[PDB]
Scaffold this active site. Structure first.
Site, mmCIF file in Angstrom:
data_model
loop_
_atom_site.group_PDB
_atom_site.id
_atom_site.type_symbol
_atom_site.label_atom_id
_atom_site.label_comp_id
_atom_site.label_asym_id
_atom_site.label_seq_id
_atom_site.Cartn_x
_atom_site.Cartn_y
_atom_site.Cartn_z
ATOM 1 N N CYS A 84 -4.262 -7.668 -10.202
ATOM 2 C CA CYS A 84 -2.892 -7.898 -10.642
ATOM 3 C C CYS A 84 -2.332 -9.206 -10.101
ATOM 4 C CB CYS A 84 -2.016 -6.722 -10.220
ATOM 5 S SG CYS A 84 -2.803 -5.108 -10.452
ATOM 6 N N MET A 115 -3.504 -3.707 -4.200
ATOM 7 C CA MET A 115 -3.139 -2.309 -4.385
ATOM 8 C C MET A 115 -3.161 -1.599 -3.042
ATOM 9 S SD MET A 115 -2.071 -0.864 -7.117
ATOM 10 C CE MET A 115 -2.869 -1.976 -8.269
ATOM 11 N N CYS A 126 30.945 -2.796 17.761
ATOM 12 C CA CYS A 126 30.410 -3.322 19.010
ATOM 13 C C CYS A 126 30.825 -4.767 19.227
ATOM 14 C CB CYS A 126 28.887 -3.221 19.029
ATOM 15 S SG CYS A 126 28.114 -4.247 20.298
ATOM 16 N N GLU A 155 12.882 -4.768 -7.825
ATOM 17 C CA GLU A 155 13.352 -5.895 -7.033
ATOM 18 C C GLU A 155 13.634 -7.146 -7.851
ATOM 19 O OE1 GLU A 155 11.100 -6.047 -3.512
ATOM 20 O OE2 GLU A 155 12.127 -7.777 -2.643
ATOM 21 N N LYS A 206 3.324 -3.684 2.999
ATOM 22 C CA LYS A 206 3.623 -4.818 3.872
ATOM 23 C C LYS A 206 4.939 -4.540 4.581
ATOM 24 C CE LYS A 206 4.873 -7.187 -0.418
ATOM 25 N NZ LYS A 206 4.859 -8.492 -1.129
ATOM 26 N N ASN A 254 24.674 -8.202 24.453
ATOM 27 C CA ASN A 254 24.866 -7.661 23.117
ATOM 28 C C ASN A 254 23.603 -7.905 22.308
ATOM 29 O OD1 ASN A 254 26.148 -8.897 20.108
ATOM 30 N ND2 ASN A 254 26.101 -6.711 20.606
ATOM 31 N N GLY A 255 23.072 -6.846 21.706
ATOM 32 C CA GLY A 255 21.870 -6.968 20.909
ATOM 33 C C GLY A 255 20.750 -6.066 21.383
ATOM 34 N N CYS A 310 -3.505 1.795 -16.265
ATOM 35 C CA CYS A 310 -4.084 1.236 -15.051
ATOM 36 C C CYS A 310 -5.229 2.111 -14.568
ATOM 37 C CB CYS A 310 -3.021 1.104 -13.963
ATOM 38 S SG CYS A 310 -3.668 0.626 -12.346
ATOM 39 N N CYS A 324 -4.881 -8.706 -15.742
ATOM 40 C CA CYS A 324 -5.243 -7.296 -15.698
ATOM 41 C C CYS A 324 -5.738 -6.862 -17.073
ATOM 42 C CB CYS A 324 -4.057 -6.443 -15.264
ATOM 43 S SG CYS A 324 -4.513 -4.781 -14.727
HETATM 44 C C1 FMN Z 1 2.394 -2.654 -8.279
HETATM 45 C C2 FMN Z 1 3.448 -2.213 -7.308
HETATM 46 C C3 FMN Z 1 4.577 -2.994 -7.121
HETATM 47 C C4 FMN Z 1 5.555 -2.588 -6.226
HETATM 48 N N1 FMN Z 1 6.670 -3.373 -6.051
HETATM 49 C C5 FMN Z 1 7.643 -2.981 -5.165
HETATM 50 C C6 FMN Z 1 8.763 -3.772 -4.992
HETATM 51 O O1 FMN Z 1 8.874 -4.815 -5.629
HETATM 52 N N2 FMN Z 1 9.746 -3.389 -4.107
HETATM 53 C C7 FMN Z 1 9.610 -2.216 -3.398
HETATM 54 O O2 FMN Z 1 10.490 -1.880 -2.611
HETATM 55 N N3 FMN Z 1 8.494 -1.423 -3.566
HETATM 56 C C8 FMN Z 1 7.508 -1.802 -4.449
HETATM 57 N N4 FMN Z 1 6.394 -1.012 -4.626
HETATM 58 C C9 FMN Z 1 6.254 0.254 -3.838
HETATM 59 C C10 FMN Z 1 6.821 1.436 -4.606
HETATM 60 O O3 FMN Z 1 8.219 1.296 -4.682
HETATM 61 C C11 FMN Z 1 6.495 2.743 -3.900
HETATM 62 O O4 FMN Z 1 7.086 2.734 -2.623
HETATM 63 C C12 FMN Z 1 4.996 2.959 -3.760
HETATM 64 O O5 FMN Z 1 4.326 2.425 -4.877
HETATM 65 C C13 FMN Z 1 4.680 4.444 -3.683
HETATM 66 O O6 FMN Z 1 3.364 4.608 -3.213
HETATM 67 P P1 FMN Z 1 2.240 5.203 -4.191
HETATM 68 O O7 FMN Z 1 1.469 4.033 -4.747
HETATM 69 O O8 FMN Z 1 1.313 6.118 -3.433
HETATM 70 O O9 FMN Z 1 2.895 5.955 -5.322
HETATM 71 C C14 FMN Z 1 5.410 -1.405 -5.513
HETATM 72 C C15 FMN Z 1 4.276 -0.626 -5.703
HETATM 73 C C16 FMN Z 1 3.297 -1.030 -6.601
HETATM 74 C C17 FMN Z 1 2.074 -0.191 -6.811
HETATM 75 S S1 F3S Z 2 -5.472 -2.140 -14.656
HETATM 76 FE FE1 F3S Z 2 -4.962 -1.214 -12.700
HETATM 77 S S2 F3S Z 2 -5.599 -2.493 -10.917
HETATM 78 FE FE2 F3S Z 2 -3.545 -3.200 -11.512
HETATM 79 S S3 F3S Z 2 -3.543 -4.854 -13.054
HETATM 80 FE FE3 F3S Z 2 -3.419 -2.864 -14.182
HETATM 81 S S4 F3S Z 2 -2.673 -1.357 -12.607
#
Ligand code: FMN
Ligand code: F3S
EC number: 1.4.1.13
Lengths: 1468, 116
Positions: free
Chosen positions: A1104, A475, A1, A882, A933, A231-232, A1098, A1109
């Site tokens: 965390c 979490m 493009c 990551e 997020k 463009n965009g 966990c 933890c």
């Molecule tokens: C503690 C924790 C750290 C995570 N860190 C990353 C991350 O650094 N980069 C990423 O793309 N996803 C991260 N994820 C998301 C996982 O890759 C995955 O998409 C997600 O945990 C799956 O959902 P579930 O908790 O139902 O299994 C993280 C998830 C958890 C629980």
């Molecule tokens: S105990 Fe469970 S709540 Fe997180 S810091 Fe360890 S996975």
């Protein structure tokens, strides 16, 4: 493009311009997408002047007498299928042209060639004709063009009024003509043979080649438009079209006349974003204004509160922002009037633009520099365009206006400084008004009335007023969705926020807050087609949140002009009280508006034990939409109070629906009450209120930047949300344009819940607030997904091998009431059961499993290594995450294990990314977002960064690290196709997998990514965990993955692309039934994720983000790491049990393998809860089954998708002696712009052969002549040296690790080195080591996320060295704006000649000073010596000659974190 | 060690056979046969007396400080059949190299060209 423009400075028609334009079109095929047949494209077009002599000779050949005045030509696409429709269309055109009395010379059928266009774009090919009209009445040119515009509008209206589809007037005028189509960009000149004639001559040509996102084409949606070529993508289209619909009622001008009543619907229906932009542009140009002024008014420059701009342009920008709201987003515009030709950028500077001036007075601008060939002996100035810049050409006077000169010529028209002085910003008003109490019983009464709890209140309110920031969860949320709950939940739980993933990137908030505006204007709407200081007579506010003090000040200001409305309704009313209350408030506010009142105040202070309160969201939506539909919203500024507003999400959704300002009095009452008891300590009430206001403002800015919007003036009333769990009638009646694919509860359930909560509150004497269980778990209520009993049962079943215990666990999990969408489903089958043994082997379904990665910085390396060992043992595939990975993990173990991974993430941080790190893998992973997020990116707290993670991430220990939300190299799908090309180039044996997040309308992005040579899509729900994230992001974003998966599968099957890409989902999977349902919806690969973590220690403590933890999983200190109790045998048993359950259920269903069920939705059915009485969630669209045809629903080819070859191949055949003996080599080649990623495959080869640092520097050198393409030297290891003579396009030196790049103008250059541009944008994105010596001005985002590299550049652009972490950057000359923002590690050396650096730099975390220690002086001396030895730049030699006098002209930029950790003290 | 390739890729088999050796014929890609050159087409290459050092004597298996003059005729090429036999020999001893003759432009070279 790409877009481009060629203009002549003198202003004389000629043929060379059109020749250059067609030549530029013929060399852009590398950017645009490719097809399988090679006969269909996405759309191309050119826009030139009208060849008067050509059509005059045509008319003379016909037999008429050509007049001397101009001759207008209009091009029309008529329907082709029928024949009588063409006749009616011709009759329409003739009867609407002959109305004004003009004379027609006849029609003409342009000959075309119909063997180039593919069959897909041929089934919808319209019939192209031209009409030639002439002026016999003899009027001037301006009136002629105005009459032709009005004629075109009238024709479009009269045709739309008869349902005659596929009839388009492309361009009708006497100055311009448009040749556009759906062919390939290359074959344009062989499709329209008219352009081959040398009698076409012009003085300006604008060409465009778009990039589609749908397989089905459409001709009228192909750029360029009449007065634009965009463009965009424009983000704020909904809010902008709503405010345009509002303004449509009071815009008039004596230039048009009665025909103004024809142009009421200024924006049609069924046009793209650029289409609406163009039509509003054309209106505001034809109204009488000029092109630069309207360009300033539509998309202005970021109003900075700095001393970089004189007050003239400041007042100009203030007036511009006072007239019309902006149009945010990435946009590189190239528009043209009949007089001016302007090129311009957006507010941020995302898309690229580059222009060049020749010696014969010809300017050539485009997206890339090498698109047109000019000899080096004729260039005069190679420039660029920063954020908010623009460059114009005047054809009548024949002049060229650059940025500052054009800005001055604009600001010298009207006295903008005097006109802007008639405003009033409400600060001195409250200051002088300040010179001029609720008891706790009723306070708790109302707090219980609105369902507020106690612990969930202070958990989110005290951290706001204590430090000024927001809380942090730890979490993924498994709380029920807004409709499946049994307890009271406000309306704000029903609106999920929006975000942008691929089409346009988000915007950072901490380092780009200078370009975001939260100003609010009251009483400012007016005739946009008028210009007088009456428009700058309004009220100004700095933020739309108002405490009681400022609200009372504004109330006293307005006083008698307000019209306060109730918001309460009788509790004892019939079953239809809410509807009557809505009608009442609607009529009341409409009559108050007609009563001349210029203000409406929605307030519900009339709540008592006999009247209930309406949710303010609904009232505001109804009032706003009614004032829009009654042509009255342009008059009154809506003002709203409430008694529920506590969190930022509530205020965001309340401002997004139409309100102008919101005042939450009850929350301030509660805060004052908590202060009167002494909880904060010594902090006054005013300090707490200031912290609260700042926290709300930052939350609003975060929610805005979530989707790439920087102005609250354009987000207001935009409806950038998604309502899940509401009826279609209500959401379409009482709200702006939104989407709710599945239905939900209606007005009855809302009233029922409100009345029940109000009865629980006031009827009973409540004494203390409940404890609440939304965020944390409690026994009082608020059921969750993970519980204590379930966790203990899972741990026992996995630690004792008891498959029976796992069966009991699954039975416990399934018996619970419906807590998710899929629980409302039930699988069925009519076939006969089959003995379990015939089901495929356990391993065959165990190999369909994966485990989503987690960053090493989040959880302890022990758990990461355990996961990797278990996965590499079982045979499935794991993920690294990551935070990079340990190098020494690349070796197997003596016991039969391996501490390596199988999938590597390439995220928006690029921490440990290195040409080697992308080799020991099988499936690359490009993270765009996640479930916890969407638009924030990964973040890591401060004290979790030990020395180990510091040496892993090339970062500074002890300091926080928050990765940038948007991919600095992904601003549109074009750059994404580019990035996937580079990633498939660096690795020959990998498949690149993209990650996505569920939302509405993901099908377009899905089809795009499929066309972008991807291999595996990954859809994530909203139930994914994290290591650190805000609470609003966790609880109020994303959609369940079932909806998104169904949508993406249907879209990929609809466009016949499903067989070319697999599918994979994750997020909250525990049992086998969910796996079978995911397989039924269309998934093929499944990730379990957090469940595995629970089988490893966990137990959902959710601490965390504090590094403490208990069990020792998400920790980074010694004591807690030793409490780890994990074992790979646990994970092996877990996956064995999952596969066993899948086998059993599939045997019970009546099939024999998984291939027999993937893609089938005719096995599911819906069962409802009759006792709940709620409107049955219409899950029917989630079961929509489209027939696949001949290609199977699951089918996929073997091996990764192929990719064309670059120059690298030609090197690896001529350098084979190197790969067989290892000797020095010097090669030379010519480099065109089309060639991409020059020199990455050789990097991969030498990485496999000698490693990262196996060869001494300069072991192999390459010389390139001409103009290098994009991504020069991507991931080049030490030992390679590249030297290009000419200019580089963009993304040069991306991912550099040890290599060496050199750019320099060729030896015959008559240009000046330090006064031109030589490279592109985002240079050295996340490099690790190596050098980069150049000679010239770089681009924007220069050396972002750099860590370790050494770069030497002569001048750069805005946001220089942003988010740096290490290495050294030596800049010579002028620097851009917002320099060194967010820099954390490294050092910078600037050469200032006017001491302007203290004005541009950002004092956030850097300090600038003079050089004092002889050590740094000698280091910089050596660097400059090396640079001038390499490139032989004359400016560097001139500096080195006068060094003893230039040591003082230098400035040093040092991060605020390395003030003492450095070896040599930087301050004597 | 620095990636420097100091070897020679084309080897010569001249009328002197000074340094020819079974090992010297396998460190190549193409072998070349010398008949005559443009300066001394009849008398063959010569080397002065005071030029030959000890290293030159080791290279050419000779006595130090002696006037070395190469015999004009190839003692194993007395007819074109000898040339064919010598090319057979060279292609036998090296299984992967090419052979090349070296002539000097003169009239009546066509028959020689066809023969070679
Ligand atoms: C503690 C924790 C750290 C995570 N860190 C990353 C991350 O650094 N980069 C990423 O793309 N996803 C991260 N994820 C998301 C996982 O890759 C995955 O998409 C997600 O945990 C799956 O959902 P579930 O908790 O139902 O299994 C993280 C998830 C958890 C629980
Ligand atoms: S105990 Fe469970 S709540 Fe997180 S810091 Fe360890 S996975």
């Amino acid at each position: 493009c790409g877009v481009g423009f060629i203009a002549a400075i003198d202003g004389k028609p000629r043929r060379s311009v059109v020749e250059k334009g067609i030549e530029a079109l013929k060399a852009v095929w590398h950017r645009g997408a490719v097809d399988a047949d090679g006969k269909t494209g996405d759309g191309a077009g050119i826009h030139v002047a009208v060849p008067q002599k050509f059509f005059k000779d045509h008319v003379k050949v016909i037999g008429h007498r050509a007049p001397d005045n101009k001759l207008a030509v209009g091009q029309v696409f008529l329907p082709r299928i029928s024949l009588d429709a063409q006749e009616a269309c011709r009759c329409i055109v003739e009867t609407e042209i002959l109305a004004f009395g003009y004379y027609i010379y006849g029609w003409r059928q342009v000959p075309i060639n119909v063997d180039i266009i593919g069959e897909k774009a041929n089934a919808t090919r319209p019939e192209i004709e031209q009409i030639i009209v002439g002026n016999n009445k003899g009027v001037s040119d301006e009136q002629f063009e105005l009459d032709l515009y009005i004629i075109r509008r009238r024709i479009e209206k009269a045709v739309k009024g008869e349902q005659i589809n596929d009839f388009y007037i492309c361009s009708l005028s006497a100055r311009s003509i448009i040749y556009k189509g759906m062919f390939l960009a290359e074959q344009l000149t062989t499709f329209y043979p008219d352009l081959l004639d040398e009698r076409f001559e012009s003085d300006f040509a604008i060409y465009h080649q778009r990039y589609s996102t749908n397989t089905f084409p459409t001709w009228p949606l192909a750029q360029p438009f009449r007065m634009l070529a965009h463009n965009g993508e424009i983000n704020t289209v909904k809010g902008n079209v709503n405010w345009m619909k509002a303004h449509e009622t009071r815009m008039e001008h004596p230039a048009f006349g009665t025909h103004m009543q024809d142009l009421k619907p200024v924006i049609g229906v069924g046009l793209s974003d650029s289409g609406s932009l163009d039509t509003v542009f054309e209106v505001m140009v034809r109204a009488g204004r000029t092109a630069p002024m309207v360009k300033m008014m539509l998309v202005p420059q970021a109003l900075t509160s700095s001393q970089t701009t004189p007050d003239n342009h400041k007042a100009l920008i203030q007036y511009c922002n006072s007239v019309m709201e902006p149009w945010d987003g990435p946009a590189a515009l190239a528009m043209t009037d009949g007089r001016w030709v302007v090129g311009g950028m957006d507010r941020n500077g995302l898309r690229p633009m580059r222009y060049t001036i020749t010696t014969d007075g010809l300017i050539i601008g485009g997206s890339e520099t090498g698109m047109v060939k000019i000899d080096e002996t004729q260039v005069i100035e190679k420039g660029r365009l920063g954020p908010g810049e623009m460059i114009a050409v005047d054809l009548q006077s024949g002049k060229l206006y650059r940025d500052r000169e054009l800005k001055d010529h604009l600001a010298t028209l009207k006295p903008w400084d005097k006109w802007v002085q008639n405003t009033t910003h409400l600060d001195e008003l409250v200051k002088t008004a300040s010179l001029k109490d609720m008891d706790k019983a009723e306070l708790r009464r109302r707090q219980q009335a609105f369902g507020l709890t106690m612990e969930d209140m202070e958990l989110i309110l005290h951290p706001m007023v204590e430090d000024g920031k927001e809380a942090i969860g730890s979490m993924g949320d498994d709380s029920p969705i807004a409709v499946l709950s049994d307890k009271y939940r406000g309306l704000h739980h029903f609106f999920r926020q929006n975000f942008s993933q691929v089409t346009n990137p988000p915007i950072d908030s901490l380092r780009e807050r200078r370009v975001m505006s939260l100003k609010t204007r009251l009483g400012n709407l007016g005739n946009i087609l008028d210009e007088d200081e009456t428009q700058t007579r309004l009220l100004q506010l700095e933020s739309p949140v108002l405490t009681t003090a400022e609200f009372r000040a504004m109330r006293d200001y307005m006083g008698d002009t307000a019209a306060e409305i109730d918001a309460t309704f009788p509790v004892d009313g019939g079953p239809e009280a809410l509807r009557d209350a809505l009608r009442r408030i609607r009529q009341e506010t409409e009559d108050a508006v007609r009563g001349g009142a210029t203000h409406v105040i929605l307030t519900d202070e009339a709540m008592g034990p006999a009247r209930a309160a309406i949710p303010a969201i609904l009232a505001t939506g109804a009032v706003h939409t009614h004032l829009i539909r009654s042509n009255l919203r342009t008059f009154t500024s809506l003002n709203v109070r409430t008694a529920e507003g506590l969190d930022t999400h509530y205020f965001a959704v309340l401002i997004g629906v139409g309100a102008t300002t919101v005042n939450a009095y009850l929350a301030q009452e509660a805060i004052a009450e908590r202060h009167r008891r002494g909880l904060f300590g010594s902090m006054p009430l005013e300090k707490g209120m200031a912290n609260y206001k700042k926290a709300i403002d930052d939350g609003l800015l975060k929610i805005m930047s979530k989707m790439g919007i920087s102005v609250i003036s354009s987000y207001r009333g935009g409806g950038n949300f998604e309502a899940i769990g509401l009826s279609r009638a209500l959401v379409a009646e009482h709200f702006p344009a939104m989407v709710s694919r599945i239905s939900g509860i209606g007005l009855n359930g809302i009233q029922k819940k409100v009345l029940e909560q109000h009865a629980t509150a006031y009827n009973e004497e409540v004494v203390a607030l409940p404890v609440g269980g939304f965020y944390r778990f409690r026994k009082s209520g608020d059921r969750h997904g993970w519980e204590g009993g379930v966790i203990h049962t899972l741990q026992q079943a996995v630690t004792n091998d008891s498959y029976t215990t796992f069966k009991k666990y699954s039975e416990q999990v399934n018996k619970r009431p419906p807590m998710q969408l899929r629980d409302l489903l039930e699988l069925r089958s009519t076939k006969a059961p089959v003995p379990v043994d015939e089901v495929e082997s356990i391993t065959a379904i165990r190999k369909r499993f994966i485990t989503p990665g987690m960053s090493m910085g989040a959880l302890s390396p022990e758990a990461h290594g355990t996961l990797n060992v278990a996965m590499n043992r079982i045979g499935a595939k794991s993920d690294s995450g990551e935070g990079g990975e340990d190098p020494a993990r690349f070796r197997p173990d003596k016991n039969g294990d391996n501490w390596n991974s199988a999938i590597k993430q390439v995220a928006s941080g690029r921490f440990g990314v290195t040409a080697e790190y992308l080799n020991q893998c099988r499936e690359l992973e490009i993270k765009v977002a996640q479930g916890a997020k969407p638009g924030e990116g990964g973040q890591l707290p401060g004290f979790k960064v030990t020395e180990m993670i510091a040496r892993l991430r090339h970062s500074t220990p002890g300091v926080m690290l928050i990765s940038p939300p948007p991919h600095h190299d992904i601003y549109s799908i074009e750059d994404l196709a580019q990035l996937i090309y580079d990633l498939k180039q660096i690795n020959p044996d990998a498949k690149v997998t993209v990650k996505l997040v569920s939302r509405s309308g993901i099908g377009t992005i899905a089809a795009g990514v499929a066309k972008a040579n991807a291999d595996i899509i990954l859809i994530s729900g909203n139930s994914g965990g994290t290591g650190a994230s805000p609470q609003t992001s966790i609880k109020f974003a994303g959609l369940p993955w079932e909806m998104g998966l169904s949508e993406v599968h249907q879209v990929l099957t609809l466009n016949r692309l499903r067989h070319r890409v697999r599918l994979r989902t994750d997020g909250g999977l525990k049992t086998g039934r969910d796996i079978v349902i995911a397989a039924m919806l269309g998934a093929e690969e499944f990730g379990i994720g957090t469940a595995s973590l629970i089988a490893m220690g966990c137990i959902m403590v959710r601490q965390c983000h504090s590094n403490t933890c208990p069990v020792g999983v998400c920790v980074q200190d010694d004591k807690l790491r030793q409490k780890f109790v994990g074992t790979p045998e646990k994970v092996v048993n877990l996956f064995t049990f999952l596969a066993e359950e899948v086998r059993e259920i599939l045997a019970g269903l009546g099939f024999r393998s998984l291939n027999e069920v993937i893609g089938r939705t005719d096995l599911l059915h819906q069962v409802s809860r009759g006792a709940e009485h709620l409107d049955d969630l219409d899950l029917n669209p989630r079961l929509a089954q489209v027939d696949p045809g001949e290609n199977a629903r699951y089918c996929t080819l073997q091996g990764r998708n192929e990719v064309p070859d670059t120059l690298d191949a030609r090197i690896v055949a001529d350098a084979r002696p190197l790969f067989e003996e290892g000797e020095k080599m010097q090669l030379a080649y010519n480099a065109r712009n089309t060639q991409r990623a020059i020199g990455t495959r050789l990097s991969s080869m030498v990485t496999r052969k000698f490693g990262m640092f196996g060869l001494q520097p300069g072991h192999i050198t390459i010389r390139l002549r001409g103009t290098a393409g994009q991504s020069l030297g991507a991931f080049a290891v030490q030992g390679i040296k590249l030297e290009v003579m000419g200019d580089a396009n963009d993304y040069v030196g991306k991912g550099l690790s040890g290599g060496t790049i050199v750019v320099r103008p060729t030896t015959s250059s008559p240009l000046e080195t330090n006064k031109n541009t030589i490279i592109g944008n985002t240079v050295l994105y996340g490099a690790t080591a190596g050098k980069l010596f150049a000679a010239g001005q770089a681009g924007e985002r220069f050396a972002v996320r750099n860590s370790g590299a050494t770069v030497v550049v002569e001048g750069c652009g805005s946001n220089g060295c942003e988010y740096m972490t290490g290495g050294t950057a030596v800049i010579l000359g002028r620097v851009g704006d917002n320099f060194a923002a967010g820099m954390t590690g490294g050092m910078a050396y600037v050469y200032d000649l006017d001491d302007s650096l203290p004005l541009y730099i950002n004092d956030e975390s850097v300090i600038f000073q003079r050089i004092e220690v002889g050590h740094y002086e000698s280091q910089l001396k050596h660097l400059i010596e090396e640079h001038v030895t390499e490139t032989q730049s004359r400016f560097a030699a001139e500096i080195l000659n006068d060094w003893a006098r230039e040591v003082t002209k230098f400035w040093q930029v040092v991060p605020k974190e390395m003030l003492n950790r450095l070896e040599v003290p930087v301050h004597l």
